[PDB]
Write a protein that binds this ligand. Structure first.
Ligand SMILES: *[C@@H]1O[C@H](CO)[C@@H](O[C@@H]2O[C@H](CO)[C@@H](O[C@@H]3O[C@H](CO)[C@@H](O)[C@H](O)[C@@H]3O)[C@H](O)[C@H]2NC(C)=O)[C@H](O)[C@H]1NC(C)=O
Ligand SMILES: *[C@@H]1O[C@H](CO)[C@@H](O[C@@H]2O[C@H](CO)[C@@H](O)[C@H](O)[C@H]2NC(C)=O)[C@H](O)[C@H]1NC(C)=O
Ligand SMILES: *[C@@H]1O[C@H](CO)[C@@H](O[C@@H]2O[C@H](CO)[C@@H](O)[C@H](O)[C@H]2NC(C)=O)[C@H](O)[C@H]1NC(C)=O
Ligand SMILES: *[C@@H]1O[C@H](CO)[C@@H](O[C@@H]2O[C@H](CO)[C@@H](O)[C@H](O)[C@H]2NC(C)=O)[C@H](O)[C@H]1NC(C)=O
Ligand code: NAG
Ligand code: NAG
Ligand code: NAG
Ligand code: NAG
Lengths: 183, 322, 195, 49
């Protein structure tokens, strides 16, 4: 509550150079995000808490109950600081330092360990990360791979004529109509 | 999010939104349905192969100059030069002011793999030719291959025999001159940034839409609570929250239309990489404005650029027939 | 082998089950969505009339008869969208039933993931399944090429076929089977010089 | 206005402005759906051409 400008959020230190008479600082959404303390000319910046949601990466509940959460684009050296509920919540706030925390371009995946060799992938994680439930079973995150780089002996005299074949029969499935409804 | 856009940094609003319930839960499902298809497109446009090829260190392509399209190892990335200008021409504080939950999720694929997929195709279409979209690719040198693509027009192979030297060098000049035409102006790439301009100004309209009073006394939730009775406060705040939720449905119902037309360009570009670069196409004025030879794909920010190497006849003469 | 792949998993028929799932789950939300009060005093409607006077009972029922009136138009709007790609897949289906089955398709990778042979429709709930009988090449062998020849001091090039040799003679083969044949005047024509 | 005073006619007239505004948003939406169908048929003619 600064001069009747109510709200909610944490306060930080700002380097903005307010004019002698200006006091509030707005943004595109016409939301106050920079106020000057009435007590002294110090400039404060108002920021929200840690946000962005959490995208848990779990196999089916038919299989084990192991998880590996994801934080959307947060440098999570600050998630332990933002967490004061470790005693209150079991197996949730403890994830601030769980398995070997890994850092991607889309925030830090927590609860899994990077592996070197590249396979096909199952669960799209983001920014170049997939996972699967393997090894003693745990969560392993890696980088995708269409396959081993097949080197072709390109040459100005080389060609390849197949000498056999196969007649595959694949099934393409197409919808043609939905259910007729009436209200 | 359901609440980060309406009941952010407040608690008296989060309780009120819960009774509504199934509305914004449908919102999250709509924008999650769009997101998944945004990967079913790029996985289909480029990744119609099962082996990431790569050209050998030898770079003598049939006598035709190809350095422009094939990535140069000396560059930090295996990215072709044209993609440098292509990524340069396209333009993108644009996210730090989106504290309202509009968190642009990054694509699953990254720009290098998309380049890695893209370079596979030119690795494919040049080394393997028109038979690498049908399973096991077969190496094809680039010089004598023309005797078959030309053969799919009506001209005998003798065009590339009786007129090899003049035909061979002519294909060289046109390829190089295109780089200059790419550097001509911004009108050529008008069909890419229009997408990023359309899909970024919409976000800006959504964010500034929060400032609307929607018939309420105050545009901020915290102020309306502190100057009127609690029993009558229910209808006042409920007026505003419906306005925002109605305004949120307008934004999503525009993306459903937008996602339904990029799906067309995601299903026609999946043909020119399946009927056109993988075989001399015959849909007239679809690949080549004229009799067709082949194509050469490239990449771009949220789109694809093709270089359809067409074939247009030159000057003519008249005669007498029977 | 087809029947095993059909019973291999539950995702084989995932592109029809989605339609019935996405057009029966839509109903369930539409039924549930009328439990919301929309800011009124109660979800049920007879109690509103039996508890407040007609002078100001119309204020609240107005807020409720507009919430449902817009909770219902949204279902229609999402239904116009869902009928636009089915109309855009009954046109591709009425096309693979128009060229795959009514003839053979010259498109590359349209009626078959590779060179195409035939097609078959099998009627399915709210859809169709195409047993796209397809050709796919198998193992290969290595050869060296020379797209020319000159024997009688002048060019003489074949009617149709490439000049590939294994080490003994240059042979003629088509583009997806190793099928050689010796040089003969029948498939050979003279065309210009050989320089 | 000529019958009911300004003090409460705002909410009374607000019930009528929202009636028309909801109708425009319906009319324009049906155009966006329709305009795609013509665009679909504007390319099944640009091909037969
Ligand atoms: C390359 O493929 C040919 C195809 O069979 C292999 O056979 C060699 O070439 C011709 C085959 O048309 C033979 O010439 C004739 O053979 C018959 C039957 O032996 C003979 O009666 C005739 O008088 C005439 O010689 C040739 O003999 C045959 N063998 C050799 C050693 O040249 C050929 O072996 C293959 N070359 C390779 C794999 O290096
Ligand atoms: C293509 O490969 C198949 C698979 O082996 C070949 O089928 C074999 O044919 C021979 C004689 O024709 C039989 O003795 C084998 O038992 C067959 N294999 C199987 C698995 O049944 C076929 O002959 C090959 N075709 C060509 C032209 O080489
Ligand atoms: C086709 O033309 C290009 C034109 O740049 C050639 O690239 C040049 O290659 C020479 C050596 O052959 C280098 O000395 C030049 O520096 C290259 N140019 C540039 C701008 O770097 C290319 O080599 C030609 N194709 C072939 C097969 O020689
Ligand atoms: C046979 O196939 C091979 C496939 O790699 C062709 O390439 C030769 O591979 C061998 C290794 O098995 C090397 O020793 C040769 O040096 C490769 N050839 C060249 C030109 O480098 C080979 O050319 C094919 N041979 C024939 C006669 O078709
Ligand atoms: C549950 O997982 C097990 C693997 O331990 C698998 O065999 C089983 O089929 C799964 N359940 C169902 C219903 O598929
Ligand atoms: C993330 O935090 C680490 C440790 O404080 C720091 O070294 C790194 O530069 C940070 N990365 C950012 C802010 O992008
Ligand atoms: C994994 O790869 C890194 C470099 O990519 C290497 O330093 C490390 O030794 C590798 N470890 C194993 C177990 O292969
Ligand atoms: C293929 O290229 C190499 C090097 O460029 C050359 O020595 C050889 O003669 C070429 N072969 C043909 C058939 O052109």
């Amino acid at each position: 509550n600064f001069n009747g400008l109510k709200g909610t959020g944490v306060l930080t230190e700002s380097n903005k150079k307010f004019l002698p008479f200006q006091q509030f600082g707005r943004d595109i959404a016409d939301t106050t995000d920079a106020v000057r303390d009435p007590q002294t000319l110090e400039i404060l910046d108002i920021t929200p808490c840690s946000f962005g949601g959490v995208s848990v990466i779990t196999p089916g509940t038919n299989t084990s109950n192991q998880v590996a959460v994801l934080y959307q684009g947060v440098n999570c050296t600050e998630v332990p600081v933002a967490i004061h509920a470790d005693q209150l919540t079991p197996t949730w706030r403890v994830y601030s330092t769980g398995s070997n925390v890994f850092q991607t371009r889309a925030g830090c995946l927590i609860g899994a360990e990077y592996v070197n060799n590249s396979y096909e992938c199952d669960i799209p994680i983001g920014a170049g990360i997939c996972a699967s439930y393997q090894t003693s079973q745990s969560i392993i995150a890696y980088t995708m791979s269409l396959g081993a780089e097949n080197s072709v002996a390109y040459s100005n005299n080389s060609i390849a004529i197949p000498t056999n074949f196969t007649i595959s029969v694949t099934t393409e499935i197409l919808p043609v109509s939905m259910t007729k409804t009436s209200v | 999010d359901c609440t980060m856009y309406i009941c952010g940094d407040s608690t008296e609003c989060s309780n009120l939104l819960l009774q509504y319930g199934s509305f914004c839960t449908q919102l999250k499902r709509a924008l999650t349905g769009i997101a998944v298809e945004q990967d079913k497109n790029t996985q289909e446009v480029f990744a119609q192969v099962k082996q990431i090829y790569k050209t050998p260190p030898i770079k003598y392509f049939g006598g035709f100059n190809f350095s422009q399209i094939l990535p140069d190892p000396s560059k930090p990335s295996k990215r072709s030069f044209i993609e440098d200008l292509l990524f340069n021409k396209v333009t993108l504080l644009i996210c730090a002011q989106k504290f309202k939950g509009l968190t642009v999720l990054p694509p699953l694929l990254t720009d290098e793999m998309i380049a890695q997929y893209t370079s596979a195709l030119l690795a494919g279409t040049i080394t393997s030719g028109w038979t690498f979209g049908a399973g096991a690719a077969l190496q094809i040198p680039f010089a004598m291959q023309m005797a078959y693509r030309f053969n799919g027009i009506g001209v005998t192979q003798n065009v590339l025999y009786e007129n090899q030297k003049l035909i061979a060098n002519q294909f060289n000049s046109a390829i190089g001159k295109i780089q200059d035409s790419l550097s001509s102006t911004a009108s050529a790439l008008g069909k890419l940034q229009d997408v990023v301009n359309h899909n970024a100004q919409a976000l800006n309209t959504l964010v500034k839409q929060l400032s609307s009073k929607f018939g309420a006394i105050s545009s901020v939730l915290n102020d309306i609570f502190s100057r009127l009775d609690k029993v009558e406060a229910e209808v006042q705040i409920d007026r505003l929250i419906t306005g925002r939720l109605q305004s949120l449905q307008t934004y999503v119902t525009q993306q459903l239309i937008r996602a339904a037309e990029i799906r067309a360009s995601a299903n026609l570009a999946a043909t020119k990489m399946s009927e056109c670069v993988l075989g001399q196409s015959k849909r007239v004025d679809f690949c080549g404005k004229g009799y067709h030879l082949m194509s050469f794909p490239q990449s771009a920010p949220h789109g694809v650029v093709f270089l359809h190497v067409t074939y247009v006849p030159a000057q003519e003469k008249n005669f007498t027939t029977a | 082998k087809i029947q095993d792949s059909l019973s291999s998993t539950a995702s084989a028929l995932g592109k029809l089950q989605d339609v019935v799932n996405h057009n029966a789950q839509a109903l369930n939300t539409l039924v549930k969505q009328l439990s919301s009060k929309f800011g009124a005093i109660s979800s049920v409607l007879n109690d509103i009339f039996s508890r407040l006077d007609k002078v100001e009972a119309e204020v609240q029922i107005d807020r409720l008869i507009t919430g449902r009136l817009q909770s219902l138009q949204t279902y229609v709007t999402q239904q116009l969208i869902r009928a636009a790609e089915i109309r855009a897949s009954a046109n591709l289906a009425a096309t693979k039933m128009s060229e795959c089955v009514l003839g053979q398709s010259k498109r590359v990778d349209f009626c078959g993931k590779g060179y195409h042979l035939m097609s078959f429709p099998q009627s399915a709930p709210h859809g169709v399944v195409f047993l796209h009988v397809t050709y796919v090449p198998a193992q290969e062998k290595n050869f060296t090429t020379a797209p020319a020849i000159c024997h009688d001091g002048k060019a003489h090039f074949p009617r149709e076929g490439v000049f590939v040799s294994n080490g003994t003679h240059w042979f003629v083969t088509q583009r997806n089977f190793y099928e050689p044949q010796i040089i003969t005047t029948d498939n050979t024509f003279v065309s210009g010089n050989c320089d």
